[PDB]
Amino acid sequence: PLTASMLASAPPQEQKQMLGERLFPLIQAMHPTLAGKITGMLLEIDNSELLHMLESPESLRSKVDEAVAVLQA
Numbered sequence: 001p002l003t004a005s006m007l008a009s010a011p012p013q014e015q016k017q018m019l020g021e022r023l024f025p026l027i028q029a030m031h032p033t034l035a036g037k038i039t040g041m042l043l044e045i046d047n048s049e050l051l052h053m054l055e056s057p058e059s060l061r062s063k064v065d066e067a068v069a070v071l072q073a
């Protein structure tokens, strides 16, 4: 499980990658087809909220639902 401390201690060039690797499987469970896109959309959020999402399923959902509204016609 990823921690702020773990995140803060990693070289910045890798932080988003670390978050993406953790977020993507969770996002793909909700949406196999829109997963790359949703994940890319979400990595745009500031890291510290991303961590809160990894840690609250409900936060991740609400963020995903709202990513999907961006994607729709």
Ligand SMILES: [Cl-]
Pocket (backbone or CB within 6 Å): 030, 031, 032, 033, 034
């Ligand atoms: Cl889907």
